[PDB]
A = this chain, B = another copy of it.
């Protein structure tokens, strides 16, 4: 016996199994020494490698012939029978696993490789409905996998679901800094068209980063659409009497070109006006001014003629998601740029002069 182990549950571990290292075989498991409360596992490694063995090492266990799918994959490694018959143990060093050996007496055998990387990077979410969440669900940023949900805990004292997820140690300091918005993505089949196609197969969690204190306690927000594409933009609040056909994902239009989208919809402080939160992209941030009137351009408007009736149908997005359109009135002194927070007043009718304005906006 060269290095011992401890664990609470031993589903896979079988005596006589082979010790792996980077999916390569060195060492041997010899003894499962049982206890009533917490079982003990003993390992043999060679006398040269135990000098190479570091106190910053973690041991993770896996067992059985695993065919992994992982999209379009089936391959099984060059494997001995000792994994095929008995539950194996692999190991590797990492940087900051010294704290797991400072606490307790001996090392712990993690149930898989995922729980072996769950030191320091483990965060906790709070969701009202775990109908979209799943164990093994990846947390993605810009479509790059930076984390994974590993468990789901239901609480009936406070009726909500605590999902504890992990982050990889490169991104544990960059993310989880407070003001971080975790949001699931999901397919939508409704009056609003769908943009997410892969989420029918495998849903993930989009994330917005933030800056501040390392909180590591988060709330899962609703399924948001604006956050993924239109980011780090100029946030504009517009007040309206009605909602109308507006919604999350409704485009903001300038001469028919989509310059931004609506982030969210909320009642006002006093319940007389709804506020519609939108973001304009950085390339189009300079377009809005302090004198930039909005108007609701939602759905089809056509004029009847008595002698003869001229009609036109664009089949545009504002039928499905009724957009807000704007233009700047002409002024030879130009009003300054819009601030990070500014309240606009929506006009109910489209002002007729908007074709003939022609306000020069440079850069």
What residues of chain A have their CB less than 8 Å away from a CB belonging to chain B? 9-14, 17, 22-25, 32, 36, 52, 63-67, 69, 71-72, 74-80, 85-87, 128-134, 136, 141-144, 146, 152, 154, 156, 159-161, 171, 174, 186-187, 189-191, 193-194, 197-198, 200, 209, 228-229, 241-246, 254-257, 265, 267, 270-272, 274, 287, 298-317, 319-320, 322, 355, 358-362
Task: Closest B residue to A192 by CB, please name it.
Answer: B315
Given A156-B174, A228-B129, A274-B255, A12-B309 contact (CB < 8 Å): no
Task: Closest B residue to A314 by CB, please name it.
Answer: B245
Does A300 contact B304, Cβ atoms closer than 8 Å? Answer: no
Does B144 contact A154, Cβ atoms closer than 8 Å? Answer: yes
| Distance of A246 Cα from B256 Cα, bound (Å) | 9
Min C-beta distance of A263 to chain B, whole Å: 15
Does A78 contact B315, Cβ atoms closer than 8 Å? Answer: no
| Distance of A316 Cα from B242 Cα, bound (Å) | 13
Task: Closest B residue to A321 by CB, please name it.
Answer: B315
Does B64 contact A77, Cβ atoms closer than 8 Å? Answer: yes
Min C-beta distance of A279 to chain B, whole Å: 16
| Distance of A77 Cα from B146 Cα, bound (Å) | 29
| Distance of A52 Cα from B186 Cα, bound (Å) | 49
Given A143-B130, A228-B129, A320-B191, A255-B270 contact (CB < 8 Å): no
Q: How often does this chain occur in the complex, in copies?
A: 2
Q: Using Cβ atoms and an 8 Å threshold, which residues of chain B touch A134? A: 71
| Distance of A200 Cα from B198 Cα, bound (Å) | 9
Q: Using Cβ atoms and an 8 Å threshold, which residues of chain B touch A75? A: 64-66
| Distance of A200 Cα from B197 Cα, bound (Å) | 9
- Can you spell out 29 A-B residue pairs with CB atoms less than 8 angstroms apart? A9-B22, A12-B78, A17-B78, A63-B78, A66-B75, A69-B74, A130-B142, A131-B143, A131-B228, A133-B143, A142-B154, A144-B152, A146-B154, A189-B193, A189-B194, A189-B197, A191-B193, A242-B255, A243-B257, A244-B256, A255-B267, A257-B267, A271-B287, A299-B313, A302-B309, A302-B311, A304-B305, A306-B306, A315-B322
Given A64-B78, A77-B12, A255-B242, A161-B190 contact (CB < 8 Å): no
| Distance of A286 Cα from B220 Cα, bound (Å) | 25
Does B306 contact A301, Cβ atoms closer than 8 Å? Answer: no
